Amino acid sequence: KNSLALSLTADQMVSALLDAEPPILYSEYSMMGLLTNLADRELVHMINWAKRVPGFVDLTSHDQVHLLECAWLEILMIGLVWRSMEHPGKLLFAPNLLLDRNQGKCVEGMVEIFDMLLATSSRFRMMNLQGEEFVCLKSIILLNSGVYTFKSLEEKDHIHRVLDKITDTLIHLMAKAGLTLQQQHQRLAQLLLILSHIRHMSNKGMEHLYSMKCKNVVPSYDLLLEMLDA
Amino acid sequence: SNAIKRSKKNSLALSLTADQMVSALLDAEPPILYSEYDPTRPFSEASMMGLLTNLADRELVHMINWAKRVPGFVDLTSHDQVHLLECAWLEILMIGLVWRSMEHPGKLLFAPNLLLDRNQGKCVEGMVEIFDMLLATSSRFRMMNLQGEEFVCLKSIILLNSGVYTFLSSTLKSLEEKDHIHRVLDKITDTLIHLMAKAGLTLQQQHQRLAQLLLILSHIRHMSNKGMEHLYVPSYDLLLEMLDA
Numbered sequence A: 001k002n003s004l005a006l007s008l009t010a011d012q013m014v015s016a017l018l019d020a021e022p023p024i025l026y027s028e029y030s031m032m033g034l035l036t037n038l039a040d041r042e043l044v045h046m047i048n049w050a051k052r053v054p055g056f057v058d059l060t061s062h063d064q065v066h067l068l069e070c071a072w073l074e075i076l077m078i079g080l081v082w083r084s085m086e087h088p089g090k091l092l093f094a095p096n097l098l099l100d101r102n103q104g105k106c107v108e109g110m111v112e113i114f115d116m117l118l119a120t121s122s123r124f125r126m127m128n129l130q131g132e133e134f135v136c137l138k139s140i141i142l143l144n145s146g147v148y149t150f151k152s153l154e155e156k157d158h159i160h161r162v163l164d165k166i167t168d169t170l171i172h173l174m175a176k177a178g179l180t181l182q183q184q185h186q187r188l189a190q191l192l193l194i195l196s197h198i199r200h201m202s203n204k205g206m207e208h209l210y211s212m213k214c215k216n217v218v219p220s221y222d223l224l225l226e227m228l229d230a
Numbered sequence B: 001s002n003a004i005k006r007s008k009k010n011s012l013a014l015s016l017t018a019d020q021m022v023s024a025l026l027d028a029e030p031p032i033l034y035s036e037y038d039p040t041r042p043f044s045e046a047s048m049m050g051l052l053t054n055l056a057d058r059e060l061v062h063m064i065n066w067a068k069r070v071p072g073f074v075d076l077t078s079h080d081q082v083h084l085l086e087c088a089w090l091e092i093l094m095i096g097l098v099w100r101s102m103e104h105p106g107k108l109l110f111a112p113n114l115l116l117d118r119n120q121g122k123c124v125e126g127m128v129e130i131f132d133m134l135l136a137t138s139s140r141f142r143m144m145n146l147q148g149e150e151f152v153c154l155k156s157i158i159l160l161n162s163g164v165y166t167f168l169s170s171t172l173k174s175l176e177e178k179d180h181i182h183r184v185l186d187k188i189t190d191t192l193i194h195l196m197a198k199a200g201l202t203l204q205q206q207h208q209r210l211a212q213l214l215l216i217l218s219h220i221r222h223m224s225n226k227g228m229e230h231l232y233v234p235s236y237d238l239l240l241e242m243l244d245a
């Protein structure tokens, strides 16, 4: 790759990811109905956001779709946890759809995943997660989630090199904030280990979508391919 | 205290050096078990699932003995030890399998006498999808030149990390348990960085390799979740009895 993405400084990588951030959307107004409509509107923004993640458009269309297929629900979930950080005990699906755990029990099948999302929001709060760190983590999910389940060798190499640039960026942010070398490596590990919990929540979420008879609302390969080209 | 925040556990686990942590984890490694001798081939779905179930059930007993020797693990309540093992057991079996399989490209070494290619994974329902994910992880460990000392650190991280976010309590006790787990996880990070610095990696290479290793743990979680979904498993009570025995 002749890629500009691999020439970016930590400051340029953060600036690109901050400028690509989607807005917070409102619910339009059935809990599953509201959430499905919100997710569908978020997906359109997510496609346009992914195209602005440095290195993402260097991939084939097929590899872009594979990464989005694997990451879309993890990306929605980390957004939700980020929006909810400053509302302890609550999930801010949207500014006009803020649910506490009491309302999560009233809706069958909600509460187990609700509780996992609340624990993630609490962990982000306890770590004082910064916006610059959040955008790095969301980009890692996009590039990392599908990379182990793929020209192909060159594509995987390029993804790992962009992932290395995002690591460098996270470490730069922490060094600039005044963290010791030891604190830098410890916080990097703490952030990346939360990604294992977001993967778990995404898998449980998919299983719950299936059990609610909502197989239809998962974006297909073909849907993502058409949205990328459109 | 106000001046020096620490774990509240009455424990030397957090006082270990990086060298002592690696030594403890290496010495705790469970044995490699064999499958049945000369089983009827070709396998059916039932006989393959029979062999794998029997091997996993025997591995579980040794995994409990290993978990008890992970520094900091026995400082937790019995209930929290079982929660961590409940959440991590299949990921721990899977990273063991990927480690054993590293030197056999295209194959999964379930045991020295049970070496399977992806074709033999088709015998069991949706097991080829997970077979292929396990092969890609073994290739990734090969490509990274994963070291034994790194592997034992990663397997201990899985044990402590996988269930830590689903202690949903916020009693003083629960906060102390979570704080202790995060401090032991920080010590294992320090240990991994020490191993990389000792090997001669630059600071930039150390942070990049640390990130590459921890991001593979997200894929092992994925494979474990898909495995469970495809299946439909040690009970709380079974794990609790094995911990006390």
Ligand SMILES: O=C(O)/C=C/c1ccc(N(CC(F)(F)F)S(=O)(=O)[C@@H]2C[C@@H]3O[C@H]2C(c2ccc(O)cc2)=C3c2ccc(O)cc2)cc1
Pocket (backbone or CB within 6 Å): A030, A031, A032, A033, A035, A036, A037, A038, A039, A040, A042, A076, A077, A079, A080, A093, A104, A107, A108, A109, A110, A111, A112, A113, A114, A115, A117, A204, A205, A206, A208, A209, A217, A218
């Ligand atoms: O009976 C009813 O009306 C409804 C019952 C109900 C039972 C479970 C439930 N989920 C658990 C939790 F905690 F989030 F609520 S979930 O399926 O995992 C899943 C998690 C989160 O909520 C669901 C979802 C979704 C995604 C695509 C879609 O097409 C429809 C829904 C998510 C989401 C959406 C947007 C966003 O920005 C972030 C996250 C949600 C409602």
